[PDB]
Each structure stands twice: as structure tokens, then as C-alpha cells.
């Protein structure tokens, strides 16, 4: 930097013949080592009645501030490094109207972690009130209370990694002291004095060097949040928390995985391309995974956790071993139970193949935070079988936060926004669409040894010396709630953004092309998030830490949808935000009798109850108002209808399809090698939606000589010693091959095989291909398999680019799915625990969605709450607008409660109650006249039993933390709040002298 | 002197000079300035690598000395923010966009000719501290009387003899009359030898066969003779026309005058161009010890990069044996396109260590008396050995220079002896054992002065780090030859004198792997050099054109512009010891460096100070020019057909691909005949083919035979072998030239929002939008012309497509007051902010919207290879129109939470076209009638279920028809 350190410049002069004192003992820098402790340990006991003061699930701890002189000394040395100035702290400040809603959802929210998707509901008993007037005297009909529960399922996003954290080393007295330790080893003592215990000698200095890679220093703030992500990911796995298992067993036992779209006894709906590949996988019994639907018809896959993320590691890979450029983090010392958990998180690296949540487990490893338990910093490894169950798994998070972030309490809260951003609202109603969102990942650039710091500062014991206590758990379970509270704010905000695009942006279908429909919705978001930062230049400050592009973060979308101050969500410097990924790939249903959807005339004028009764008695997925094979149907022309686009040709789904026959040479060799795998690999589990470009780019990369593609071909038996290049496999175009097409057994009979072998991603991995290369190539293979399944069934091989695939294209535009409407219904009810809240006023004769005098909510939530209520009673309220359309609220053509978007003024005309227990709620009597229906709500939070919960907090455990520690001194003496800390020596000047030797140059006499 | 007899002050000045000279002499031996204090021990290299303007820019201090996976990316980001007034979707709101463009920088050995001239000089400007005490400052009196009290004779009885023959030997070579060679006292010659050798074995990344195949060796592990170390060569490779860039400019210019070393390095590079080669094994062989007019080259190129070359001999034992094996250094081609050169420890040297101990040196040999290098015999040997031939050494870069410096000192075969190690040693040279003891001890101990050292440190830093940006569409820069001198190895004080055992601050051993020095040397060239490329990017010709005079050609049109070049003024040259003479074509780099970082100029950073004071001059003609080696000449997307320069730039196509900075700007094959200056715009290019004498069946060229014939793209080549085609394109307004990015990220202004009018280059309000329009149309992807009425020479129409940045707004060739922007292809297609390019074209014309840029750019170090995803999120053309003012409308306006209506934003600036049949047209006769309702049928069947835990099955099914048969109806 501009200046050499002050300590380095200072001289012994002026001197004198009488300057006896040794060099070491002047030019010694001024240090006053012990630094006062700065924070207060405990929640506070009430003075009277002696009953401990309560703040829920909370542990607060004390941390060392450092003396003024000592930071100055740390500074003279670190002349030339950059450490981020402090990230700002702001609460989130919301608009007045939204303020009241966010407070209520926040107050108690308790997830119920059923089969792979977070579960919440507010059970609500509501008294429908019918208001109508006779000449100024009011009337009311409220016959019975509907009992119904609004459940808001939160399913995790699809993650892919691109952006890598910039090299600024997050600022800590662990980081500052690491920076010195690297600079001192490398650039020899005299860029700093020996900076740690055990860095004095050499053979201490050499062992620290060999480990710790050169660019290798402190980014815990970024490495912490990605750990938090994966353990929260693992918390959905081994949910019961009475689960006890071996790590291999945990990998092998098959929990449901959270796949894209809803499925019903006689239809499936709105499932991504990944989901549609896996539907065939379940249907044809060819794969080992079965697609299953959680209650309410939701969707789930039944694979082993091993199968999704972790396939393709040859037996070289385990445990994030030393000098692989990975993070290598320090484990605190605890019963094997906890040590086994950290080992299992980043088992032989599992790359991102997304089950809905498979992603979360993957994320820790990809950024490279790969805990180690060997080697001198972190305790002895724990045997293959140590059964970490959800309790030891929570300990790990608990400690991760206490020793990451140095108790800063900005970064730890800042993590929550990124963890909350990973979760959607789920898709239930049978044509949801409306989900064009994926959290894009960063991988930390900077790799440094985890135990290098701890081994070099251990004066006595040779092991990392951070100790787990039973207070880390209190922090773990406290954080779990802090995540559980902030997620409700994020998930609500996201819905609002979706509504903003749905209502206002223009969304239209041409030829019933769903992706192209969805892709537009993604664009609008992508532009309703960029404006949120609110200046050109503040983005650059907010970026500073991250060097992916400025792709704006996913919860920035929630910041716009929500009241919109952007400082709270990802701060001006917010290490590791995840930006936006285009996960919009499709709708695509299918039926018991593969068929298209019948379109039902409903004619608008003359609303009769019986036609509306028949519709309710109809089935939920299959009815679709407008057929868009030829026409572009915007929700201004066609509000509130499903546009059923008919089976999907070869032609839509081109930017998706991965088998094609157009390849030029020695890419013919590569592509034939890819096909041969696809056709043979029994048991492949799909979720990576590889496009035509992914295989295009892979085969181009694979063909051209770079050392990586070169070694691959020499490994896999192509192109080094190959005599049957030219003819053997360049004219082998599939639709030649004999015998079985889905079984590894190749006869010695068979004629026509590509090459007489099959390589699994163990050998290819044991000839040394980056785990990235083998995975992506193996990912393509699996995708080509699935795709082979659809072609077979499909109306043809897409010889014609209008050939009909077996499934659908049906998008529900001008409609909010059950997940979005339940989300509003949950939030709407919490503000209406006591008050009446009249919902629909003048049901006929003005817009359904209206804002008037006292609201407490927008007015989607008012009608959304109304929808969910009429659902659980037995009502089918049809809202019909003069023009041409008709859509219902409560029950629907989709099934269950779905409020329709108002791009066109909706007016109610008739309600049709399914079944008669003749004790109805007065609504039909208010539609003949026109009156207001007030809804007195009483709700009860969906609180499950202890053995399926996100967070359990211990109300009694406040007995432990309250008291404030302290060491009261008897017999006077003076002990201030002062504890010893590290210190460092500094350069000093040493004057050295060689032992005198005589050769035959020197004068001597 | 007589006058100063007679000045009132004159006698004091005399008493004082004499008195200081007389005391200073008495004890030369206790003289050093290295050990004075912790910084100026270890040569004041603590803090150099990161200045403070640059830290701000964010470059990390890991230092950019190639390590297995190091790439430096200069990426700038801007965030344009248009405030749209008459939107096509409801009437107001603004639309922020954000993108980032990434440069690439390379660092490595710089190939342009090294003009190092080595002459023994006798002076104390550098030398050594013991020497400095030894000769009095001004009064010339014999000192041997005094010197003897302090030095044994065996050293000085013997040294003088070495100084006699060495003088005769050089008189041998230049046939100089031997009065006129002088015995050396300068030590820049040494500081350089030991220093160069160190900043090679420590910088480079070494491939040890730790087991089985090649591996890396950790920061701490032995270097066995068999270590391939590959040094990243400031080059880039690719596909598309420019196979390698940037070549030495001058290899290309029509008459070369190249030396023996370049002729077997340029041919080596060219064979490397074929789209299928990996590591061109250049073996050199057979060189006799009278002289070298007979050395067989050979080229075996194996087409993968890692089968780099191998030899059967451990470190050669005496040079004549070392000679026989001959010296072979492979070149291989990269990942990330950094052409890496690889060489083996056995090659750089031959085993001096012929230790002979503690008795008067024998009638003819050099002996180094090393005090307390214990067991560093191997680290020492590597530092001080006659390079393998020990004669004419054919290593491509600095090594060739280092060998030449060594060769000036001793004829082939003067056997060097080491004393103070016991009789033998192994060569292992584990690294610090290299820099701990070896380069630091070696120089501190001999009292060798900061000043000798900053000079070696900057000079090496200069010929191991010329960093030239990676633009492959067009060339880079032609990194210019630098002119420096250095005296041979023998040194009065260092070579035969005792080793001075007392330290002052930091202690010789406690200096680690010399990261301070090594990063410091590497950094200095890159930071200083980067401006020169950056400076070139930043500034160009004012009107966008370069004058051409008659038959011309690009090399020649290169020296004519020089007459009009401008450079900043140096200032305070106190440090360079009157080696300060110019050619008016040599400006030291740090002429430029002051321009970019203006801030460096007051002397507060060694990086500027150290550089300007003692930094090789370079040369500045050829620096405009770019040279790259292209596959063929004459079928290039853009040969602008000579004529446009003749009639005038009727058209110019700038087409910027999806992601990178680069513009494949157009050039005019530039030897095109005419009778007067016709102004070219925008690039002048020249294709040349060189053919080199053919190889014997195996791989023979004799070094002398190697003769290159320039011919041009209109002269016949069936005869004369060819190896590569040279194209050099010179350019004025750096748009779409990789540098533009280099100029922006590093000099360019940052972090303050400034509106299109201020950024734009045009004058009137009216013609400031047209440029702002021309780019914003060009982002989405639909070409946009700015057409000018023919008068002037600006080129009638400039059109650009593809992803342009705003500073690039800055460089578009004027536009004033004649010309309106017209969209070339109007086909309306989905786009990103817009659709139907025209509605836009109208949009700009009305002053509806303005776009205000802010950008921040960071220089970066990337150490772990990273994968990125570029998503263009893009709206449809079918249904961009429709979405008719959702917000004036009073139904929507009423189902939307209030702020939304309040805030300015919009998904689109302008709506599109062409919607397909417009409504849910389903022919009736498709609407079934809902069957009559059944009144009494219980609803448990349809009413929505409520939360119960678990998950249960789906039953569906299909059968897989045989795939193969359908694969038979084909795909897909």
C-alpha cells in the first residue's frame, strides 16, 4: 500500500557507544494486550417475584472488544489488504397498510414438516354475516360456522451455481489474524513477526504452509450462510427427530422428495419438464422412483437421498480432504453424534440435481464448505456409524452461528433473508403455472484451511479448541424460529410481486406455449426487482462483496412486492445473496385416458343454480375455458380461464429436447457415446431439465482438445488407440441397435453395439475427470434416457416438428393457485382474529375486488379469505362479467379455493351449495338484493405434535441463561472486565550474528 | 581544483572531502545499508505490490504470479436507468438494467526483442557497499595500502588475475583493442544473474512426478531436476481468424533483423497455431565450443497439451557434457487460453558446484567463498552456474539473457568452485532453501546495495511481466522492445571476496518464500504496463481516422502517426544515474503510468517511484500496432474492400457478440495504391505470409539457414514453405477493442450517475439522443444505423448491433446536426426492453425518455475456476402490445395494493406487433353441455380435503413401445 508499516520503518538511531540494550528490547511496539469484554451475558431476572424475564428462544452472549493500541498494531502490519467496511443494520420498515399484516403472520408461525414441504395453516372457524337492508333497518343471516384450515405449503426453489464471492475477507479478529498468518508464512518473517503460538519455529511454519493454499484467508460470513442453508435443507430430511440412523442408511432410506406439480386421481397439472420426465419414470416402472401426492393432491417423488444429489462419485471422493481447495472448516469438540453430522453434510461431493429440496443438501458442498475431522485442528473423525438424528443436526447450526460472524448480529440475521428466499409457496390447485422462480447460487472464491487457525493458536492441547455447550442448541433453535418468522414475510412478498406481474404486466398465450407464457412472467419480475435498490450507485456498494453479475437477488423481488425499503433484505454490503434463475419451464398435464380437456360452454346470461351445481359436481383438473391452439389469449380478452393448449408437439419443447440427429463428425463420436449410456442405465432419477444448448455446449467442449476434454476421451475408450473410429462409430446412428435397450447385459451375440463396454461415473472418475466434468456429462446422459421414453410413446419420433407428444399444455391465467390464495387466507385471518372485516360488499353490481373505509388488508386477501372459507363449507360462488367470462370463488373449475384476477370488473350473480345439511349461511338471499357479508373469524394456529416441527424452543430453558454469569470478587483486589486475547509480537528488530569461520579470504593474523 | 584553493570556503571544502574520504576508507569492512532496519533490510520490498489507488480498485494481494489456476478479470459494471415518458404501456416509468463486461489480462514472459547490452564498466553507482567504502568519494589516491589491512591477499592476489583474462576474453569477442574494455565494478550484472534465476524457480509452477504421472508441488516441496515449470506467455489462442495474439509486433513488420533465439522461438510459436497441436517440442542440439553456427532445431508437436518434453540426463556435470544433450524447451497451449511455456530444472543450469575448499584459489578458476550457507550447496549452485551450454544459450526469453550475462564473464568451461560446503551436495533446492538462504542471503551478505537491487527487481519485473489484454477478434498490443544494459557477472566485491556475516533488522533466514520480492517484481511490470495498454485504449485519433500516405502499409503508417503522438512529462529523475538519455522515441513506461493513475506522481508509492527511476525505456513507435497469427489471409469476414478508404466509409459494421467486450472492427487490407493521402476509417490492416527453410526428414533447421521471406497476399507461395500469416491492424477510436474495457475499468470514471447528454460525444440536444438511441436500440439486438449526409470523412452510416455498453457511448464517431438514426432491419422480434425496433426509433425522437448511467468497475484476481450463467430475460412480440394501460383502467386499479399504482416502473419501454388470432376462438360444436345436476349425491367426493399427514400413491401407467423402432421413425 501507499506506505510501509510504521513498525518496519523505525530505527535504533540515534545511538551511542553506550547503547547496551538488545535490539529486541527497543523498537518493541506498544501493545497493551488484554482487551475488555463488551457485552452482557444474560436475559434479565425480574426484580420482584424472582421470575426470569422472558424473550423467547433467546441466547445472548459476550464478546471481546480490543484495546485501542492493539488494533493499531494489527493495522500497521495489515497495510495492504481490504476488509469490507461494516454492513449496515436496518430493521425492515413497511408501509402502513402492509405493516399490520406482516406483524400478524410473524407473531406465531409454526411449520409442520410433513413429506418434504413446510406446512402451516390457521384453522379458522368463521361466522358468515349477511348484511342487507330494508329501508334503513338492517338484516342478518348467519346460520352456521364453517370450519376450515388454510394451509400454506412452502416448497424449496431449484438452485444452480454461478457467481463466486469476491475476494474481500470478512472483517474479524479471527480474519485480521489469519491475514497476518498467511502473509508471515509466505512472505517471510519480516512481513510480520512470528504471529501465533507454534508459528515460532520452522517445522511448525512448514506444516502450516503445506496445508494452507496460497490465496487462503477468511470468508466465514459467506461460508456460514451456505452452511445454514444445507442444515435447514437436512432438517426436512430426517424430520421426525426421533429418527436415528447411520449416514449410509440415512442416504439410502427414501423420504419423499418435493417435485413440482399437483397430481389427482385422474389428472396431473402444472409440473415442470423435470416433473414430466419423472411422471413417466413413475408411470412406466422403468426407474426406481415413484411419484406420489401428499394430501390435497400435492406432488412428491420417492427416491433415496443418495440417488438425487450424490450419484457419480467414484470412490476417491469422501469428506472434503485437505488441500483440495475446499473450505475445510473447524469442528468444535463434541459427542460423535454431532461430529458425524458435519461429516454427512458434505459427503462425497453431491452436485446440484434438484429434487425440490435435494438442492438444499447440495448447496453446502458446492460452495465448498466441507467440514473435516482429521488432521490436528478438529477432533478425531467419528466412525462410519455415528447416528446423527435431528437433534445433533441442530447443534451444528447452533455452533456454526456462535463462532461464525463473531457474534456480530447483522450477518446472522442477514443469512435469514437468503434462507427465506429459497422457499416458494407450493402449487396445489390443478393448473397453477405462475411459478417462474429459482434461486441462483454463489460459490466462495477464497479457500483457506479450517484447522490451520486453531492449531497455530493452541498453546497446550493439540486440537481445535472451540467447545460445544448446550447453549449452542438454544441459539440453533432460536435461529430456526428467526428463519421461521422471516420466511412468512418473504413468501408473502413474493406472492404480491407475482400478483403485480399477473394483474398488470401483459401475459398472453400464443399457440398455448406455456414456457413462452411463463418466460414473460419471469421477465417482468426481473424488471420489478432491479428498480428496488433505488439508485444506480447504491447497487455498486451493495454488490462490493459479490462478483457474479448484478443479477438481482430473489428476495429483492419480495422487497418490491413488499413495502420496498431495500436495505433490510440484502444490505448495502450483503455477502452471498442469491440472484434470480429462470426456472420457468412448463405446465404440461396428463390424464388417465390420455386425452385433451373438454371446454365447457357456460354462456354467461341467465345464471341458473343447476348448471353451476353440475360444474361443482364435475372434477377439479379437467375443464378449460378457452382453447388456444391458434390464438393468443391475454387476460384482458380472456380473464379468469384455463387455456388448454392440447398435446405438446415436437415443436414447442424444441428448446428442451435433447435427442436430435444433426451431428457433424467427431461430434458424431461424442454424441453416440452419450446415447449409448442413455439407452442402458437402469435406474436414473431426473431433475436437471437440460436444454438443447447444454448438450450442444457439452459436446462442443468435449470434442475440442483442452486438457480436460482430452483426458476424458483417453479415459472413456474413445480416440487414443481407436482403429474403429471412422466406420465403427460415426455411422452407428441409433435405430440400429439389437436386443435389450434398457439393460446392461451385452451379449457376445449382439451385433451393432457402439463400443463393447459401459462406463459408469466411477471409472470415468477414477481416470481423474473433474467432478464437474463427469457430473455434467453424466447429467446429460440421464436426461437423454427420460427423453428416450417420451419419443417412443409420442405420436412419432419428432420426424415431424408438429408430431404430438402424449401430455399437455394448459395454463390457468387470471387465476391464483391454492398455494397463493391460502397464503393470503392465512395472513388475512390473522388480522381478523377478532374484528368483523366485511369482505364482499354489494356482491352484484360493482367490482368484487374493492377497497373501502376500514380494510386492514389490500383487497386480494379479503376475497382470498372468502374463497378459502366457501371452499370448506360447500359453496360455489360464480362471478360473471357482462362480456363473456365466468369464474368461481370457493370451489372452482380447478378445484378448491381459487380467487380470479381482476383485469375485468367481476360481479357475483349466484351461489351454489354442494350438498344440503339445511343449515346454510345466508349468502344466496343477499345476491337477489345487494348487501355486504361480514366475516367474524376465529383462528387456531396449525400446531402439530413435537415430532414434526421446524423449531422447538424450550420455554423453561430461560432458567439457564438468566443470571448474567459474573465473578464477584471477595478480598478486594482489582479484576475489571478484562480477559486475555492472542496479542501478537510485531516485527521488532533483531540483529543477527553468524558463528565465525575461517576459510581463506578473511584477514586473520 | 586550483580555483577552490582560492575561495574563502575553498579550503574547508577541501579539508572536508579529504577528511571524510580518509576516515571512511579505514574500515571499509563494516559498511552496509541493507541491515539498517526492517524495511531496508530485505531491500524495502515489504509493501510494493498494492498501491492505494489500486487497492481501492480491489486487486487482492495474492499477487498475479501464475499459479495453476490464476486469471485476472477486469470487469466493469454499469446500471443504465431510463425514465420513460410516453411508454407504450400506460404512460410513465423507468426501467433499470444492469450488466457486466469482463476483460481478461495475461501476464508472462514478454517476447519483444531484448536489447540488453552487457559491458563491464568501472564505477561505483551500483556495485557493492564494501566497494563503495573502498574507493574514496572524490580524491583519487591509491588505496590498496589501506584495503590490505582488511582483505587477505589470496582473494586480491587472485582476483586481479581473473580481471586480466576476463578482459582479454571480451577483447576476443568484439575484437576490441583491449585498452578500451574495462574491468568491472558494476553489480547490476550480478544482482540480475542471481535475482533472475530466483524469480524463475519461485514464480513458476512446477510439475513434479511425485507419483505415477505429473502432479503439482505444494508451496513447500522439493524441486527435483525433473520439474516442468510452465510460465504463462503473454499470449492468447483461439479459433476464428486470430490464432495467437499478441505476437511481437516486429516479428511481423516486413524487414525483421531478428536474432538466433527469436528465429527458433517464433517458428515454435507458429507451429503452435494449427488448431490441433499442443506442445511444440523445440529441441536444440549440437553446438560446438569454438562457436555456434551449427545447431539443429527439431519440432515434434504432440496434439494434446500435457505430453510436454523429456530428456535422459540428470544435471550435466561439466558444460561440454551438458552441451551434448543439448537444450530443449517445450511450449504448450493452456486452458483458459494462456500459452504456457515449460522447461526443466536440469536445463536452466549445469552443475557448478565443484567445491574446493579454503586454500589459495588455483591458477585459473572462479571460487565463491560462501560463509554459512550450510547445506544450501544446491540452492547456491542453481543460483550461480554457467547455463547448460554455458556458451550460446538458446532459451527463448530472459534465461537467454541471463546465459548471455554469464557467458560474458567466463568462456565455456571455466570451472567454478564453491567453498564452505563440504565436498559435494545434491541439487534438491527445496524453495525457501532457494529464497531463504539463497537469493536473499546471497545478496544481503555480500553487502549488495538497494540500488543494484531495485534495478534488477524492476528489470526482471519488466521482462517477466508484460501484460497485454486478450482481445482475440483483433490483436492486443505489440508489446515493444525494451532497451537496458547490464555488466557481466564477475564483480570486484562479490566474486572473490569474503562474505560479510552481520545482519541488521530481519534475518536472511526469516524471509519465507520471498513472496514480498517475488510478488513485488511481478506486480510492478503489470501495473505499470497495464496503463500502456490501458492508455492506448483510452486515447486515440480525434476524428476517427488514420491517415495513409500513398503505397504505405501498416508498419509504415505506424511511424508516421508517431510524429503526432503525445505523452506526459516525466519530472523528478534523481534516481537514475545519468542513464537518462533519450531517442524521443523512448519514453520510460512510467511516462504513461502517471497518465492513468495521475495520482501516483508525487513520490509516495515505490511502485511509481521505483518504476520511473529505473525502468527500461521501451520504444514507442510500434505500440499502436497489433500483430496476431492468423490462419489465412484474404477471406476475413471484414476486409473492407480497400475502396471505402477510397470513396469513403459508406458502411461500417460493428457487431458485438452475446457476451464479451470485443468489436471485430473492420480493416482495409492496407497496402492499397493511390496518388495522395486518403483518410482511412476505422482500421488499416496488412496480411503477410513468411516461408522458412524446410526441415530435414526429422526436424532440422540449422540456426543460420533460418531465413524469412516476406511476400504479401498477392504473391505466389507454392515454393516457399510457410508457417503462419501475420496480420497487424492499427486503430483510432477504441470502440470494441478489448482495451476499451481496460481503459474504462482502470482510468475510467466511476460511481457517479451522469446523464446521456453528459456522456455522449455529440453537441446539440438533438443529436445527443440519437447516439443514446443508437446504443439502446443496439442492446436489445436489432441493428441501428446513424446515417450521415455524405460530407466530411466520417463514413456515411455507422451501424452497431449487440450488447453495447455506455462508455462505448463515448467512443462513437461524433454525429452532429446532419444525421438521423435509421433501423436497418425492422423485423419485430421478442427483445428485452422493447420490440418492434421502430416504435423505439420514434420513441427516442420525441425526448420522451432519458437514460442516466452509473458504473463501478473492479480489477479482480480469480484463483478458482468459476462457471457463470447469462440469462437474457425476454418478453414476447406477440403479446407485448395488449396489456393496455392496466393502470388507468379502473378495475385493475382497484385490485392492486396501493403503492403499486404509485411507483414508477415498467416491464417494457415499447410495445410490439403481430398477434395471432386474437381470442379464444373455439368453433362451437366443441362446447359440451354440462349434464343435468344430480341433486342428492354426497360431496365427500369433491369437497377439498383438510390437513392429515403422510403421502399416498398415484396409480397411472403406460407401456414403453420399443425405443429402437421409434428411434427408427427417427428423432428426437
Numbering used by the authors:
A (entry chain B): 1 to 1005
B (entry chain A): 2 to 973
What do the paper's sentences say?
At difference most dsRNA viruses, whose capsid is made of protein homodimers, RnQV1 is based on a single-shelled lattice built of 60 P2-P4 heterodimers. In addition to organizing the viral genome and replicative machinery, P2 and P4 have acquired new functions by inserting complex domains in preferential insertion sites.
The ~470 Å-diameter T = 1 capsid shows 12 outwardly protruding decamers at the pentameric positions (orange), each bearing five copies of P2 and P4. Each pentameric capsomer is formed by an inner ring of five P2 monomers surrounded by an outer ring of five partially intercalated P4 monomers, in which the asymmetric unit is a P2-P4 heterodimer. P2 and P4 overlapped considerably at the S domain. Both had a long α-helix tangential to the capsid surface, the α16 helix in P2 (36 Å long, 24 residues) and α15 in P4 (50 Å, 33 residues), a common characteristic of the dsRNA virus lineage CP (right, arrows). Analyses with Fatcat, Cath and Dali servers showed that this P2 domain has structural similarity, in addition to ferredoxin, to gelsolin and profilin, two actin-binding proteins with a variety of actin regulatory functions. The P4 Val648-His805 domain (in insertion site 2) has a surface cavity in which the last visible P2 C-terminal residue, Gly973, contacts P4 Ile791. We hypothesize that this surface crevice in P4 participates in proteolytic processing of the P2 C-terminal domain. In addition to the numerous weak interactions in the buried intra- and interdimeric surfaces that stabilize the capsid, there are five molecular hooks formed by short loops or α-helices that extend further on the rough contact surfaces, and contribute to pentamer stability (labeled I-V).
